[PDB]
Point group: C2
Chain length 195, copies 2
Amino acid sequence: MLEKAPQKSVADFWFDPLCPWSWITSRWILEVAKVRDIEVNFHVMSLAILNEMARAWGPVRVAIAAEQAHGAKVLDPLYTAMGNRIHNQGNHELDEVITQSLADAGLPAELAKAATSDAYDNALRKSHHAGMDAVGEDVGTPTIHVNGVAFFGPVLSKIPRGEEAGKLWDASVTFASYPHFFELKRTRTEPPQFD
Amino acid sequence: KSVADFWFDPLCPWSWITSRWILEVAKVRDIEVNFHVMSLAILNENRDDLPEQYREGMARAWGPVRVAIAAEQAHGAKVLDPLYTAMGNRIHNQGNHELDEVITQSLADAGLPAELAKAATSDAYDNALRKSHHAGMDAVGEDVGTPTIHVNGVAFFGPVLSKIPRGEEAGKLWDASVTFASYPHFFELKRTRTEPPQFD
Ligand SMILES: [Cl-]
């Protein structure tokens, strides 16, 4: 069956700001959105929850708190502010990252108190588990949902840009639209080449 | 026409489905396929991702691999296209468990010398690859698994498919596979498998 993509495809992306691979794959999705007409929805997940390291709860608790009080629309700017500081600038002092990122995103500074409360953990677990695969397991990171189809990956070590980003998106939509596709990996295997 | 080298294990149901897919791709895209045998057991008999039939006994499982090695060494990869089609039709589509018979009938169907069946018990064939660090005939490098395909200067494991896609859909999956494999900083894309291999 010649499968056809929906009118506007959808990327649903669960993130923990601490994961470098999710950072890269989320930036790829933002690059795709510049050259393809797609919906991008960010959602919070937790490396702490995946792997149950107590500092790991701070940023996702703050992110959940911000979304609950101001809507999912603040996740994209807060994620960018946090990831720029954790990954690009390598800041491991998560107290500073949280306070700076809230200010950068234009969010109330009192949201930082969420990092040390457990009051948002129920909501965080619900959001995390909503990124579930077809049989109800957590997906390692990075993960992405393409038109409702959950994938592990694409695992990217570098951010694809521009039309190259868009071509990878077209290929992802092709794989998501074929229900009997399950895996692809790059490999370093060659035949003998005589010319 | 781009040359695609395809490394298959004769007992692997995913190699089988993806090899039927790539022959459908060659009807809607400008590629030609050269098949080559590969077994993960050559370089590491202990890994847990060997095809299921290796569980039932190594001596038995080696048979089809060694015959395919011997055939390619003596006659070139071109004869593996009919040889593999004959073996896989019996092993996978028909569930034929008697591999000695599969080998004899498949060599016959491929027009190959019947004596090549004697490679089945000769460990020279796999040990020659092993000693030079080859996971398959005419392969160097990784053996992530079977199927592995090399085309247009890049190589990939998969696509892992539970059904043989047909027509232009097969070609679209080809385009997607080559696109991902051609990005040098792409590593893996995986969806939880919800279906077993399903042959035609
Ligand atoms: Cl997840």
